[PDB]
Amino acid sequence: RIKKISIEGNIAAGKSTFVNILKQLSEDWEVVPEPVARWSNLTMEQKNGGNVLQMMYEKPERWSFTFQTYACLSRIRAQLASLNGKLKDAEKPVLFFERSVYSDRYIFASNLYESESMNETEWTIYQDWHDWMNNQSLELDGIIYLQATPETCLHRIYLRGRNEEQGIPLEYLEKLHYKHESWLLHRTLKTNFDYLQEVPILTLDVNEDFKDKYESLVEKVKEFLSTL
Amino acid sequence: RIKKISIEGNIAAGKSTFVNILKQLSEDWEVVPEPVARWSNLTMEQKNGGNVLQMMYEKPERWSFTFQTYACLSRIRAQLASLNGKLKDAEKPVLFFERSVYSDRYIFASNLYESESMNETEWTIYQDWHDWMNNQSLELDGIIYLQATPETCLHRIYLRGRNEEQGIPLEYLEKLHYKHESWLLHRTLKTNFDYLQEVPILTLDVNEDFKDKYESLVEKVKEFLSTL
Ligand SMILES: Cc1ccc(NC(=O)c2ccc(CN3CCN(C)CC3)cc2)cc1Nc1nc(-c2nccc(N)n2)cs1
Ligand SMILES: Cc1ccc(NC(=O)c2ccc(CN3CCN(C)CC3)cc2)cc1Nc1nc(-c2nccc(N)n2)cs1
Ligand SMILES: Cc1ccc(NC(=O)c2ccc(CN3CCN(C)CC3)cc2)cc1Nc1nc(-c2nccc(N)n2)cs1
Ligand SMILES: Cc1ccc(NC(=O)c2ccc(CN3CCN(C)CC3)cc2)cc1Nc1nc(-c2nccc(N)n2)cs1
Ligand SMILES: O=c1ccn([C@@H]2O[C@H](COP(=O)(O)OP(=O)(O)O)[C@@H](O)[C@H]2O)c(=O)[nH]1
Ligand SMILES: O=c1ccn([C@@H]2O[C@H](COP(=O)(O)OP(=O)(O)O)[C@@H](O)[C@H]2O)c(=O)[nH]1
Ligand code: NA
Ligand code: NA
């Protein structure tokens, strides 16, 4: 049975960097990058996603619903493709997701509703769609939360240097940070997925640069995986 | 095995009337009304759908994508519920769909793209979603096409007397009519569903009032069902 583990964290916490570290450490370890992340850098999904990203910069209250539905669809399709296609010869197969359908809804879509970028009907339609489109083989064995300060993530947005992201304000990162803490640390966020309240969570502090010094983080991962 | 038959036709051709006739004629015959039809007349789907219908009257180029995705989702959910819930004691089970996921895409969503109510990205995202969300137990054994003139349907819009529909112009009904003829009569419409080109189609002329005189139409249905 493939173990499914989500990597969760704020914008520029280090999730993509961490996932591309893990992928290389075992042939029994595979990764599903976040579609939105891949859109940001030829396929019709990439063409659609690049357009949606640009349209979102111009007016989020017009495109948030369209963006969030396509982002989540794209993720489910990509996660199921890896789950059905990969690790068939693995001894102890693990698939690492760069975020989940839960971060799609409870972090991003939720935040856009709160920022008045979706109206009540768009948010209620989104939740209905999400509740339904998520009815199975994608349920998580575990979550790894990469915890960074908003300041760390703001500095890492600067380092990554996507022109379109240099305008992201600290306040927005602080809001996303608070949502992550409520969901994954305090476990105060109510979701419509009962099993989630029971899913084991590994919290890793990634404030210190780990690109060349990640053995302690991977040790924590291997320990966490052995408990599942 | 439940036989799945779609009832296809223009606005106010008589599909709802015909489906509510059929339902009563056999305990082995069940119907899935079109969600959009039900929205037009307490549940969160009805609340969402009524809002989406009203928002669409005000500006279709804003709401067409949201409307078409929720309409099609709502249909898949309702068709699968009947397929999983009903006719378990039937000898020769038949489920009649009021329209299909194909009329959703090739008639309505297509028409809205053509009427510049969806941009290329919205239409390409819609088709991608549709291709994907349709990957199974809903494939049709047969189609029944209720063929009425645009003039007949315009007269039947008047008879049904939905205030919001009295503005529908003959030209729009003529466009929908042409799409139906290309798909179901000439079979000239290319779809992304190969099996559809092979699905048996029964064409019924419903220009004459059938509310109290429908035996000949039902005879054609029973004959058609015996060939499948
Ligand atoms: C690409 C892009 C472009 C622009 C914006 N912008 C805003 O988030 C935003 C919101 C609100 C506002 C203020 N108000 C003014 C007043 N208006 C009436 C209402 C908006 C200004 C700007 C975000 C992005 N990226 C995003 N990615 C995600 C996402 N990332 C991964 C997974 C996932 N599911 N979702 C979500 S959002
Ligand atoms: C530059 C700027 C300045 C202001 C605001 N505003 C709001 O986001 C916003 C928040 C909340 C509300 C309602 N609240 C507050 C006011 N009230 C006191 C209580 C209700 C109203 C408006 C957004 C921006 N731009 C932003 N860019 C992004 C972004 N850009 C690319 C990728 C990405 N993921 N995200 C996100 S935010
Ligand atoms: C409820 C409602 C309200 C309004 C409208 N309006 C328009 O169709 C419409 C379009 C185009 C125009 C002209 N232009 C001006 C210029 N603009 C730039 C761009 C629009 C004006 C009006 C349609 C509806 N109903 C509808 N139901 C369906 C449907 N029914 C069953 C299954 C299904 N999948 N889909 C589709 S559409
Ligand atoms: C009253 C009126 C008047 C005009 C138009 N216009 C167009 O629909 C339309 C068509 C096509 C195009 C591009 N074409 C043409 C122009 N060029 C010559 C070649 C490209 C541009 C615009 C729409 C309306 N209203 C309408 N109501 C509905 C409706 N209302 C409730 C439920 C429902 N299902 N449908 C449908 S249509
Ligand atoms: O320990 C780290 C983690 C990340 N980064 C840099 O910070 C930016 C954001 O990282 P990533 O793209 O992995 O963040 P994600 O958005 O995927 O969490 C990138 O330029 C990384 O190279 C770094 O220098 N050291
Ligand atoms: O043979 C018929 C078929 C329909 N109608 C009336 O025409 C309108 C449209 O019918 P329906 O709602 O069944 O059309 P649909 O949109 O479902 O095809 C309704 O007022 C029907 O009662 C009728 O008088 N005789
Ligand atoms: Na690997
Ligand atoms: Na019946």
Author numbering:
A (entry chain A), B (entry chain A): 20 to 60, 71 to 164, 168 to 260
Paper text:
As a proof of concept, we first rationally designed and synthesized two masitinib derivatives, named “dCKi1” and “dCKi2”, with minor modifications on the pyridine ring (ring A). This ring partially overlaps with the substrate binding site, and we decided to mimic contacts with the surrounding residues, as seen for the 4-aminopyrimid-2-one of the physiological substrate deoxycytidine (dC) when bound in the substrate cavity. As expected, dCKi1 and dCKi2 displayed an increased binding affinity to dCK. The dCK thermal stabilization produced by these new compounds was greatly increased from 7.4 °C for masitinib to 14.3 and 17.3 °C for dCKi1 and dCKi2, respectively. The crystal structures of dCK in complex with dCKi1/uridine diphosphate (UDP) or dCKi2/UDP confirmed a similar binding mode to masitinib. dCKi1 and dCKi2 extend from the substrate binding site to the solvent occupying the allosteric dynamic functional pocket already described for previous dCK inhibitors, far away from the phosphate donor site occupied by UDP (and crystallization methods). The structures also revealed additional hydrogen bond contacts between dCK and the new compounds, explaining the increased affinity observed previously by the TSA and ITC. The key residues involved in these interactions are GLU-53, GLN-97 and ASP-133, three amino acids located at the substrate binding site. While masitinib is a modulator that only increases dCK enzymatic activity, its derivatives also induce a decrease in dCK enzymatic activity at high concentrations; therefore, dCKi1 and dCKi2 are shifted from activators to inhibitors (in the micromolar range). We confirmed a decrease in the inhibitory effect in c-KIT, showing an IC50 ratio of IL3/SCF (unspecific/c-KIT) lower than 1 for all 9 of the key compounds in the SAR studies, while the IC50 ratio was more than 100 for masitinib and 7.6 and 2.7 for dCKi1 and dCKi2, respectively.
